[PDB]
């Protein structure tokens, strides 16, 4: 599942912050429902957040307070700003989507490739 | 290649000396440097070895804890700090270079020795 | 999360063989599979890599071309297909889980690693057939050493006991080494009191199960 | 990959450091593994600084310059095994040659023994001569075979035991193999041993 491109991960000291941005490959009409998944190296793909069609911003139960999902209806791009990071949030952060190409074609899934995020001294 | 020990002498039981071994004609930084001692009539016996920096120092049973070997690579000199000295430590002390950088004890060059006498 | 290797017996040089890496538990379409090899008494060495589909496959120069990897998400299984086996490839091959898109990630600040490892199978290439050891005394001439030379056997393993297991202190049974013949040899030695040599009997009991060989050898001064 | 220390000795509870020279790869960060004798290597550190879920906190990462390092703060009597560094690359990873910690202990010179071939073996056409170096430390040693005082090459093999779990020593066997006809051409069979704990070589010999 390609044609999505996350970007923004990078080393960051404990308590820093940064903004990952799921995207689209070319001229996509709309992003129905996003979602950001995490796959730290010794665990299972958890799941961290969920926007909906209009807005729901439902979060996990260990992250409320640091993670602020959003959308950019102008240039179709889901966002995810993590603030005051911690050494337990190291993982690769996948992106999900519900792309719909044109104004009448039915929806269709899409997975990303994800980006790494390391937190340490 | 020449080695020259110094720092021996007469010392009281419980006392301290520091032996030095100065090398010429050879850069010691690449080689382990060892101390041996020989009491009259006895075989020359191992005391301590300082391998290259980071590769560790090793010691004989009889001196463990009391003696410490150390290195000054820049000055091509190795040291034996001898504390808590015992009568049994009386001997001529010798330094030798291990010519094998892989540490198999190829002792080709020896000093002339320095006398240590521990008695009151 | 129980990786399981299987499929390792004995092969003639140049031959071919498949190796099966049964997965379980994790959703197999998410993770890669790596085959890490280890020669006897050396450091590990990476050999292959297969993702969910077959559209991803790297290789390692050691078996570039001689080896065909393959996947089957039907039973979460992965298969290695080795051909033109060389005399050196004798090894202990593994499995190892690991990220799917492990290339697009790797960078100057992240490296996924290999989480779960299997347990290893023992491929072995030879021309060599099953053969029991010859057992020869290592005769002693305040501690004495004595032993048994356990020579020209194949494959591993052999066991050696002393005095039917009553003598265990000071025994050293050396790791086998492969001779230029392609057969193994080792010695088993024991140190004992020199004053015992006249009045104590020393017998090495050698067992090579692959050949059903059992030999007791009295070791006399 | 070239790990710099290769036989780092150490005692219990102390601190030790181990470094993996980036062999100017893509320099993607290392991920240290650990392996005990004859088992499955485990993960210890990924991305060069973070721990693996459920690993004691004694360990640590470090990204000094372009020389990645690992530091065991306190050495539990359990941690004694080989360690491996694993650097990614363009499209193939490669494990380092790997270093091996070991138990510090005051040097022990080998006891040396020589064994002539048995008459039973000779009657079959081959002569195996065995030299035993027993219960020594550190592991490095040299065994030279001399036959009528002539140094031998190419006709011997060595085996070394794993470190003894009680006394932390090694033993070593060297086996010289000759045809019966070659064996019967010579009188003096000698094994000459050196070790850093020996002030002079130890020779054990027999006359055929």
Coordinates of C-alpha atoms in Angstrom, one line a residue, chain D residues 13-208:
Chain D
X13 CA 30.2 -5.6 38.9
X14 CA 32.7 -3.2 37.4
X15 CA 32.1 -1.0 34.4
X16 CA 33.3 -1.8 30.9
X17 CA 33.0 -0.2 27.4
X18 CA 32.9 -1.8 24.0
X19 CA 33.2 0.0 20.7
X20 CA 32.3 -0.8 17.2
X21 CA 34.3 1.2 14.6
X22 CA 32.0 2.4 11.9
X23 CA 33.8 1.0 8.8
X24 CA 32.5 4.1 7.0
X25 CA 29.3 2.4 6.0
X26 CA 26.1 4.4 5.4
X27 CA 26.7 4.9 9.2
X28 CA 23.1 4.0 10.0
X29 CA 23.0 3.6 13.7
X30 CA 24.2 0.3 15.3
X31 CA 22.0 -2.1 17.2
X32 CA 23.9 -4.2 19.8
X33 CA 23.1 -7.9 20.1
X34 CA 24.2 -10.4 22.7
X35 CA 24.7 -14.1 22.3
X36 CA 25.7 -16.8 24.8
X37 CA 27.4 -20.0 23.7
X38 CA 25.2 -22.1 21.5
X39 CA 21.9 -20.2 21.7
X40 CA 19.8 -17.7 20.0
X41 CA 21.2 -14.1 19.9
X42 CA 19.0 -11.7 21.7
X43 CA 18.4 -8.0 21.1
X44 CA 19.9 -5.5 23.5
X45 CA 19.8 -2.0 22.0
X46 CA 18.3 -0.6 18.8
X47 CA 18.9 2.8 17.3
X48 CA 22.0 2.9 19.3
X49 CA 20.5 4.5 22.4
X50 CA 17.2 2.9 23.5
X51 CA 16.6 -0.3 25.4
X52 CA 14.6 -3.3 24.4
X53 CA 11.4 -3.9 26.3
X54 CA 12.3 -5.9 29.4
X55 CA 16.1 -5.6 29.5
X56 CA 17.9 -4.8 32.7
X57 CA 18.8 -1.2 33.1
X58 CA 22.6 -1.7 33.6
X59 CA 23.1 -1.3 29.8
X60 CA 23.2 1.9 27.9
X61 CA 23.9 3.3 24.5
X62 CA 26.2 6.1 23.2
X63 CA 26.8 7.7 19.9
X64 CA 30.2 9.2 20.4
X65 CA 31.3 10.9 17.2
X66 CA 31.2 8.2 14.6
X67 CA 32.4 5.5 17.0
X68 CA 29.3 3.8 18.5
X69 CA 29.9 2.4 21.9
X70 CA 28.2 0.3 24.6
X71 CA 28.8 0.6 28.3
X72 CA 28.0 -2.0 30.9
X73 CA 27.8 0.1 34.1
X74 CA 27.8 -2.9 36.6
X75 CA 28.7 -6.4 35.5
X76 CA 26.3 -9.0 36.8
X77 CA 27.8 -12.4 37.2
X78 CA 25.3 -13.4 34.5
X79 CA 26.5 -11.2 31.7
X80 CA 29.4 -13.1 30.1
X81 CA 29.0 -13.8 26.4
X82 CA 29.8 -12.5 23.0
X83 CA 28.5 -9.1 21.8
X84 CA 27.7 -8.1 18.3
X85 CA 27.2 -4.8 16.5
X86 CA 24.9 -4.6 13.5
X87 CA 25.1 -1.8 11.0
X88 CA 22.6 -1.4 8.2
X89 CA 23.7 -0.4 4.7
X90 CA 22.2 0.5 1.3
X91 CA 20.5 -2.9 0.9
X92 CA 22.4 -5.4 3.1
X93 CA 23.3 -5.4 6.8
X94 CA 26.4 -7.0 8.2
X95 CA 27.3 -8.1 11.7
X96 CA 30.5 -7.2 13.3
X97 CA 33.3 -9.6 14.0
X98 CA 32.2 -9.4 17.6
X99 CA 33.9 -9.2 20.9
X100 CA 33.8 -11.4 24.0
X101 CA 33.9 -10.4 27.6
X102 CA 35.5 -12.8 30.1
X103 CA 36.2 -13.3 33.8
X104 CA 39.2 -11.5 35.3
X105 CA 41.5 -13.9 37.2
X106 CA 45.0 -13.8 38.5
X107 CA 47.4 -15.5 35.0
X108 CA 48.0 -19.3 35.2
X109 CA 50.7 -21.0 33.2
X110 CA 49.9 -24.3 31.5
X111 CA 50.9 -27.7 32.7
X112 CA 52.3 -29.5 29.7
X113 CA 52.1 -33.2 28.9
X114 CA 53.2 -35.2 25.8
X115 CA 51.7 -38.5 24.6
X116 CA 53.4 -40.8 22.0
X117 CA 51.3 -42.6 19.5
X118 CA 50.0 -46.0 20.5
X119 CA 51.3 -49.2 19.0
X120 CA 47.7 -50.1 18.0
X121 CA 47.5 -46.9 15.9
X122 CA 50.9 -47.3 14.4
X123 CA 50.1 -50.8 13.3
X124 CA 47.3 -49.1 11.2
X125 CA 49.8 -46.8 9.4
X126 CA 49.5 -43.5 11.2
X127 CA 51.1 -41.8 14.2
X128 CA 49.2 -39.2 16.2
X129 CA 51.4 -37.3 18.8
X130 CA 49.5 -35.3 21.3
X131 CA 50.6 -32.3 23.4
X132 CA 48.3 -31.1 26.2
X133 CA 48.4 -27.6 27.8
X134 CA 46.3 -27.8 30.8
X135 CA 44.4 -25.2 32.9
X136 CA 45.9 -22.0 31.7
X137 CA 44.9 -18.3 31.4
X138 CA 44.8 -16.1 29.3
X139 CA 44.0 -18.1 26.2
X140 CA 46.9 -17.2 24.0
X141 CA 49.6 -19.8 23.8
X142 CA 52.0 -21.3 21.2
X143 CA 52.8 -24.9 20.7
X144 CA 55.7 -25.7 18.4
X145 CA 56.5 -29.3 17.4
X146 CA 60.1 -30.3 16.8
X147 CA 61.1 -33.6 15.4
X148 CA 64.7 -34.4 15.7
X149 CA 64.9 -30.7 16.5
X150 CA 63.3 -29.7 13.2
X151 CA 60.4 -27.3 13.5
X152 CA 57.2 -28.7 12.0
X153 CA 54.6 -26.9 10.0
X154 CA 51.4 -27.9 8.4
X155 CA 51.0 -31.3 10.1
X156 CA 49.3 -30.3 13.4
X157 CA 45.9 -29.2 14.6
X158 CA 44.8 -27.5 17.8
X159 CA 41.6 -27.6 19.8
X160 CA 40.9 -25.3 22.8
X161 CA 38.3 -25.9 25.4
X162 CA 35.7 -23.4 26.4
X163 CA 36.6 -21.5 29.5
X164 CA 36.1 -23.6 32.6
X165 CA 33.0 -22.6 34.5
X166 CA 34.7 -23.1 37.9
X167 CA 38.3 -21.9 37.5
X168 CA 38.0 -19.8 34.3
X169 CA 41.0 -21.6 32.6
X170 CA 41.4 -23.1 29.2
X171 CA 43.1 -26.2 28.1
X172 CA 44.5 -26.9 24.7
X173 CA 45.4 -30.0 22.6
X174 CA 47.9 -30.0 19.8
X175 CA 47.9 -33.1 17.6
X176 CA 50.8 -33.9 15.2
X177 CA 49.9 -36.4 12.6
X178 CA 52.5 -38.4 10.6
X179 CA 52.5 -41.4 8.5
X180 CA 54.0 -44.5 10.2
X181 CA 56.9 -44.4 7.7
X182 CA 57.6 -40.7 8.5
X183 CA 57.3 -41.3 12.2
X184 CA 59.8 -44.2 12.1
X185 CA 62.4 -42.0 10.4
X186 CA 62.9 -39.9 13.5
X187 CA 63.8 -40.2 17.2
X188 CA 63.0 -37.1 19.2
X189 CA 59.5 -35.9 19.3
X190 CA 59.1 -32.6 21.3
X191 CA 56.4 -30.1 22.0
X192 CA 57.6 -26.7 23.0
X193 CA 55.2 -24.4 24.7
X194 CA 55.1 -20.7 25.4
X195 CA 52.6 -18.7 27.3
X196 CA 52.8 -15.2 28.9
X197 CA 52.8 -16.9 32.3
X198 CA 55.9 -19.0 31.5
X199 CA 59.3 -17.3 31.9
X200 CA 60.9 -19.8 29.5
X201 CA 59.4 -22.3 27.0
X202 CA 58.4 -25.6 28.4
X203 CA 59.5 -28.6 26.4
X204 CA 58.0 -32.1 26.8
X205 CA 59.6 -34.8 24.7
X206 CA 60.0 -38.5 24.2
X207 CA 62.3 -40.7 22.2
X208 CA 60.5 -43.1 19.9

